[PDB]
Design a protein around this ligand. Structure first.
Ligand code: NI
Ligand code: NI
Length: 282
RNA sequence: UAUCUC
């Protein structure tokens, strides 16, 4: 059902998707030229520790700022106050309740808010890190991830899909699914981040990953999502562990009214989706 | 932690 949700969202939001491959590639090249990869190595290791502290977090945050300064695909602080118009009163109540649900759902740090928006995955960073650490040409990484994107037009790629691909694209050996883990940052490799990057490598395909939001399109994008929510009966799961495609898109869109919700640098953003998008039920 | 694996 999950892939069906993703598929139905792609169909419905096709008009907000676009080709961003060369823009991602340009950002990846900017990182390859400008990034301190010894510190990338340092942050990767630090993020993999069983127990992390404010020292580790500062290292992540500083590196993030450096990455953010180099790339052009960035999301910016943009609060949205949703009001009736494109969205009906009923729609606003649905969105309000779902954001409230999202809100309702080891680190040793003084301020947990400094974790917010620092742990995301960005295709350009993924490409840069694979290319540099995998010791191949950027194009080698691009071609490999393109195949992964193609698989993603048909299904969620899994470890087996990945294993098969590696037979023709050895760079993908950098992605050790055994070593991948939750919340270890976009500097470390994972199948999920590789799939997100592959999704940007395609010509067409209506990949959600390529969506751009602006204040002028925010309401229409939300209205389209709500159409699909109704059609397929999508919902925010009450279990604080699962994250389905609807929760995923709603959170990512509502984090900012200006940017690329899935793939931009979002490390300059403060706040969570339920703080950055609010509803005036009036 | 908008992230892991399916
Ligand atoms: Ni050069
Ligand atoms: Ni290939």
């Amino acid at each position: 059902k999950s892939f069906l949700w993703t598929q139905s969202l792609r169909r419905e939001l096709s008009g907000y998707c676009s080709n961003i491959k060369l823009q991602v590639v340009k950002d990846a090249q900017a990182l390859l030229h400008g990034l301190d990869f010894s510190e990338v190595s340092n942050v990767q290791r630090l993020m993999r520790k069983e127990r992390r502290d404010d020292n580790d977090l500062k290292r992540l945050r500083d590196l993030n700022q450096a990455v953010n300064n180099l790339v052009e695909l960035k999301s910016t602080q943009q609060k949205s106050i949703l009001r009736v118009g494109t969205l009906t009163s009923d729609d606003l109540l649905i969105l309000a309740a779902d954001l409230e649900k999202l809100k309702s759902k080891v680190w040793d740090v003084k301020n947990a808010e400094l974790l917010s928006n620092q742990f995301g995955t960005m295709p350009s960073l993924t490409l840069a890190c694979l290319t540099k650490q995998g010791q191949v040409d950027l194009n080698d990484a691009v071609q490999a991830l393109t195949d992964l994107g193609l698989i993603y037009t048909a299904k969620y790629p899994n470890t087996s899909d990945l294993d098969r691909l590696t037979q023709s694209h050895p760079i993908l050996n950098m992605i050790d699914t055994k070593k991948s883990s939750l919340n270890i940052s976009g500097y470390n490799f994972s199948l999920g981040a590789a799939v997100k990057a592959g999704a940007c490598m395609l010509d067409g395909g209506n990949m959600l990953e390529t969506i751009k939001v602006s204040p002028q399109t925010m309401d229409g994008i939300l209205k389209s999502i709500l159409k699909v929510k109704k059609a397929l009966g999508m919902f925010i799961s009450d279990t604080p562990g699962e994250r389905n495609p609807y929760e995923n898109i709603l959170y990512k869109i509502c984090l900012s009214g200006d940017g690329w919700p899935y793939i931009a640098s979002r490390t300059s953003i403060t706040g969570r989706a339920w703080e950055n998008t609010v509803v005036d039920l009036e």
